[PDB]
């Protein structure tokens, strides 16, 4: 990409900019990204406890990785005049977000917890720094741009599927919310979200064979195969036709681009 | 679409017509459709019981939504001279159907149940008003027209698959209807529909491995691997080949259109 | 198709031939095929027992259907001079086969069982007469010719998959034939065919998670994750990559033709 | 392929070379490859024990097959001047590897075990000689070259999927490593590799529904559906979008080539 809107106020901008954007620095920063991800994985495997053994190790290790990423972000923003809205606005925004969260956790971990502790969920976004790798390795950036363009179509397919699942959830609560009168009804179709969750399980292959009772469906008279029809129609329509519609969207975009 | 057959008998027809067909009214009615669907879902989640708590709420809420949809249908039909066979015959037919069922339930819910109670299944078609949304949101109407054109070929594939499943059901009933002599035979292959249902379960991943007994298949002599051949051939031919034939039809149409 | 090799020896051949090949007779024979298939299904559902109730009904019903199909085959072969190798050789061969088996069972059922009883497996080919329907209904014949051309390429994929599955069965018998020292080893990997069958189950989604024991894989030292690698590699390669290779072949042919 | 770099030092090279490369010798060696694979399978089925019955049989049988393959490799290398780097370098390299391992096992099995016994894993590469068949049967070599070119893109898709799985593995150990306080936490999310393995099981259809406890998710207040969101998002994004991305890559290459 050509830098056209980022005019040069800074003394050495054109030099530092094309220094950072060089493929050597890109692959060195990809090295740092992958090593920091492997450091997170190593913390979670060799020391997952709440009362960590090598606690310092992980504290100072992510301290060092985060200050290196802060230095890299400063190099970048010096490169394009700290604007980051003109050139590479999306990736610069993601970089700024992750480095801000990291430096916030750093400042609080060394100099006292200023933020509430239930904010601690954000102390789990370190793992997402790895997504920046999908910008350097172009074999990965290829798949990611194909995915990012297949996303609107896929999302539309998902919304249609969600609406159909909701209709089944609405019906399931109407019909089967009293079977077993926790019964099977009261628990798997008790309310709209228990039913929506039951149908999502069934959608991904969770054996809706306990819902249908063969003695009642077959041994009884010809009026009680309603649940058979319910689950057969759901399976066919949602799982076969609509998941393959999502597939079709995915493949059409993946082979068009 | 151009209105060509709907000649103007009514005083203000050309004005009210293009008023209703304007994108603003389309998105307002999409708002009403989605809010009424969410009202159905809210009734089924926050009050699913047979002796409803906030009954009055759901009764008057669907009263109001249905009278608004009746007003909208009257606006539309005034727009095209109450014909609804010339312009947009399919969607106007669906609108008329759902609004008729709704107003029937309204009249009976406020002024006494004129219809039989076992007719009550139709009091569950409210949930399908949401399908009218697939006419306004064109990202959804796109997927729906692609599906509606892929449905002929897909239906043919399903019929071939059904015929193969029926052949297996006949064979299964003929052979394995006496295993365990409810046994496994009597119940999973007892009659043609128990066998057809067993094979539909197996088709969607329900662990046929209880049908095949390893001691009998392997420990016994080399004559008893019939059920292994049965289930392996069924799995291969129906599951792999024919469900991927359904997929192939789906993708061919989804990428052609 | 044009009849070019079937020269006319018979007195009224050109008339009877294009009488049989007319679309009216084709759809009447499709009616007879579907009704006879539904008669087989009705026998298996409403009377599956070995000591049939309405025996006489099924006996004389398939008697009548088989004599009608014998009359139809005679009409056809009179149509093309009893050659059936020149015109429509494949479908005429299938018709001759099924009608021969049917008339054999007829002659033995009315006039004594001339053949051995363990030949009785062929008395189950009635169900396959339905395949002749795939010649009349052209929406089905379309899917069937696309399948029949995708078969030589799907078969090769299946052979590659089988070869890969035979390698994993050899390795499974080599390694895991002694676990649990019926144990899990001696039963699921005991010999080459128990292992091949275990891997076919696992291939179609049968929960390999009982093979891998988490205490042994994780609690023990770093040398015992061999079965994890075995099943992860099998799943990836065979299930994902090779079943989607079969899919790819299927879709390429289904959209090319 | 034309031999252009393999100049002729040997007396009869041009004759023996095009003798070996003739289709007759290729199909005879395909016969030997398939028969030796079936000999391995027969050893594993009819004699899988550690104290083999017909031990000699298998010993001398693989002796004979390996000396025949050694003779064939010598014929080949005499054909192209023992270079095997100029002509058909990949397949000649694979042939040399497998024949070297075989002759090593032969020499040690007849004249004493020179190598360590824990090297014995290589005594299981006989099964992979069958891959050489994928060079002779061109219907198989076709599928294999299409696969070999789809492997770069597929590998990239797998790496993206692995990174997402790792991210879920890092969040799972963070959150659910204390549920049940072996518990469910301490076993299915205990460390990073238990969590990565749990998510790989779930990815291939292993019933996450035991992780999510419906009483806690629904009966409790509206704060505890975190695991529902975890597993629903994992299923959607990895199981539905990313495995179909792998499919899409596979199909694009399989239909392009
Ligand atoms: C959500 C899906 C995003 C995938 C495409 C995003 C994209 O186009 O990258 C844009 C960058 O803009 C960014 O800031 C990227 C930030 C995350 C991208 C990588 C996430 C991988 C998700 C994978 C999970 C699959 C998600 C499936 C969920 C249904 C492209 O910008 P550019 O052209 O490089 O400039
Ligand atoms: C059977 C499957 C139907 C697929 C969609 C219909 C096809 C179609 O062309 O819509 C037509 C509408 O015609 C109508 O009148 C629609 C009336 C209700 C159906 C709405 C489709 C959404 C439901 C099923 C959603 C997924 C379930 C389907 C999965 C099997 C298009 O008409 P038009 O060109 O807009 O004028
Ligand atoms: C083997 C698979 C055959 C399927 C396609 C038939 C081939 C064909 O073209 O029919 C030929 C007819 O010749 C016949 O006799 C057809 C026999 C009936 C086939 C119906 C089986 C469909 C389902 C099986 C599923 C297969 C899955 C198997 C998994 C590997 C076409 O002849 P024509 O051009 O009409 O003249
Ligand atoms: C990996 C697939 C390799 C495809 C071979 C490509 C090739 O051209 O063969 C070359 C070398 O060939 C060899 O030396 C070994 C060939 C191994 C084939 C095994 C296929 C198993 C399918 C594995 C499924 C993949 C699962 C992995 C999931 C990522 C020869 O190429 P050529 O001279 O053109 O002939
Ligand atoms: C590619 C590389 C550079 C990425 C970084 C990985 C390194 C730095 C991480 C990954 C796993 C970590 C090691 C694994 C766990 C242990 C065992 C413990 O008793 C001492 C710390 C120690 C030894 C860690 C040190 C740091 C470590 C080695
Ligand atoms: C592509 C399709 C399958 C989308 C899947 C539908 C999703 C949205 C469904 C499946 C299960 C549903 C969840 C079931 C469980 C609960 C508990 C409820 O107290 C809060 C909402 C919540 C969290 C639901 C949100 C919507 C939900 C997550
Ligand atoms: C996507 C669209 C087509 C939804 C599927 C069409 C509708 C009509 C299908 C889906 C599930 C089916 C229902 C499932 C089973 C029952 C229960 C029984 O007591 C009455 C019939 C009834 C209610 C079926 C009627 C038809 C049905 C409602
Ligand atoms: C504007 C759209 C998105 C919302 C749909 C219409 C409105 C009226 C729907 C959305 C959610 C629904 C509410 C959900 C919660 C309840 C349950 C009960 O405690 C009082 C009624 C009440 C408050 C419902 C009233 C109707 C409701 C407010
Ligand atoms: C694979 C797809 C395309 C084919 C679908 C197969 C369908 C038609 C099969 C699967 C299970 C079968 C059902 C099994 C249960 C019964 C009970 C029986 O007393 C009435 C018929 C009925 C309801 C069957 C109808 C046909 C059926 C629903
Ligand atoms: C044209 C092709 C696809 C026809 C489809 C093949 C299916 C329908 C048929 C062909 C041969 C049949 C097999 C032949 C006979 C046996 C042995 C019997 O004791 C168990 C069933 C079993 C194993 C049959 C299963 C069904 C079967 C596999
Ligand atoms: C994945 C697809 C394409 C390959 C199919 C694999 C087939 C050939 C495998 C799966 C299970 C295997 C069977 C396992 C059971 C037995 C019992 C044995 O005593 C006779 C052979 C027999 C019948 C095997 C034949 C081959 C077999 C059927
Ligand atoms: C299809 C081709 C490319 C893949 C070849 C599969 C081979 C390379 C893979 C698949 C299964 C793997 C084996 C499965 C697990 C074990 C058990 C352990 O005791 C030794 C390692 C060993 C034996 C692995 C070695 C590598 C392995 C054999
Ligand atoms: C979805 C596909 C593409 C990604 C594959 C994920 C693979 C790499 C995951 C799934 C399960 C994981 C394994 C889980 C079990 C262990 C035990 C641990 O003590 C050694 C590592 C090892 C062997 C892990 C290696 C990585 C692993 C094999
Ligand atoms: C491409 C994908 C990775 C996009 C990002 C996925 C992330 C945002 C999704 C996947 C799983 C989700 C998490 C799963 C459930 C929980 C547990 C709860 O205690 C806090 C919310 C939290 C932590 C969710 C936050 C958002 C989440 C982390």
Residue numbers in the entry:
A (entry chain D), B (entry chain C), C (entry chain A), D (entry chain B): 61 to 241, 281 to 356
Please share text taken word for word from the publication where this structure appeared:
Voltage-gated sodium (NaV) channels are responsible for the initiation and propagation of electrical signals in nerves, muscles, cardiomyocytes, and other excitable cells.
Here, we demonstrate that the removal of the N-helix of NaVEh (NaVEhΔN) results in a slow-inactivated channel, and present cryo-EM structure of NaVEhΔN in a potential slow-inactivated state. The overall structure of NaVEhΔN is rather similar to NaVEhWT (with an RMSD of 2.47 Å), both of which are organized in a domain-swapped manner and are surrounded by lipid molecules. As a result, the activation gate of NaVEhΔN is almost fully-closed by the four L350 residues, which is apparently much smaller than the open gate of NaVEhWT. The three-turn α helix of P2 was broken into two shorter P2a and P2b helices at the position of P314, of which the P2b helix underwent a displacement of ~9 Å away from the center of the SF. The structure demonstrated that the fourfold symmetric channel possesses activated VSDs, a dilated SF, and a closed activation gate, revealing a possible mechanism of NaV channel slow inactivation that is distinct from the symmetry collapse mechanism of NaVAb29.
